[PDB]
Design a protein around this ligand. Structure first.
Ligand code: JJY
Length: 203
């Protein structure tokens, strides 16, 4: 609780220099190390821990605004094209192209038995929509079924991702700001840690 105030300060001092950038994004991702063979950190939760994080979140903030969206992502030469989805789950029309550049990443120390936490600040710069002419299947694809709960300046993202047949579960919290420069504060970061640590520690 005092040590949590210190981490929040350490995070703020590292990222403050970046908030002047347009299109800045901040997120905390639950995950684990050495759960797949090619990767170090994998941003995923078990099917069981996903559904009780879902039950927790949906009772604790039932008043909160909520949305659900199915989208079709295709990665192409470092850019991400997002496609809307029809009844069956198939790509229709491209809705956004962004390029994501990681500006700062930090691994958060967690309690024993909890999911690992990864804090990242990046830029997601929108792009020229005429590149959508490459179509929804010009590269590796990800079908995302996202549940989104917004609570003040915090958005919870629970996503069932189907890639290459296998389905995985992702849990992240993002910053929701009218202006990241003014609003993303140290006291905000400390609440991010507090809320993210809650999710990581059930059971
Ligand atoms: O929108 C832009 C800006 C110009 C450079 C650029 N290059 C690529 C894309 C998008 C953009 C893609 O969507 C994937 C292919 C490479």
């Amino acid at each position: 609780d005092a040590e949590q105030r210190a981490v929040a300060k350490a995070l703020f001092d590292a990222v403050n220099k970046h908030l002047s950038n347009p299109f800045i994004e901040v997120e905390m991702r639950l995950g684990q190390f050495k759960v797949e063979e090619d990767a170090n950190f994998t941003a995923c939760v078990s099917t069981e821990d996903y559904e009780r994080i879902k039950t927790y979140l949906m009772t604790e903030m039932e008043n909160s605004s909520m949305t659900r969206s199915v989208t079709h992502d295709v990665s192409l030469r470092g850019w991400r094209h997002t496609y809307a989805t029809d009844e069956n789950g198939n790509p229709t029309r491209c809705v956004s192209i962004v390029r994501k550049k990681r500006l700062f990443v930090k691994n958060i120390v967690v309690p024993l038995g909890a999911y690992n936490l990864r804090f990242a600040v990046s830029t997601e710069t929108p792009g020229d929509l005429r590149f959508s002419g490459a179509g929804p299947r010009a590269g590796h694809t990800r079908l995302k079924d996202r549940l989104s709960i917004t609570d003040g300046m915090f958005r919870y993202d629970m996503t069932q991702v189907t890639e290459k047949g296998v389905l995985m579960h992702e849990v992240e919290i993002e910053g929701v700001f009218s202006s990241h420069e003014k609003q993303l504060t140290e006291s905000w970061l400390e609440e991010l840690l507090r809320r993210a640590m809650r999710l990581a520690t059930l059971r």
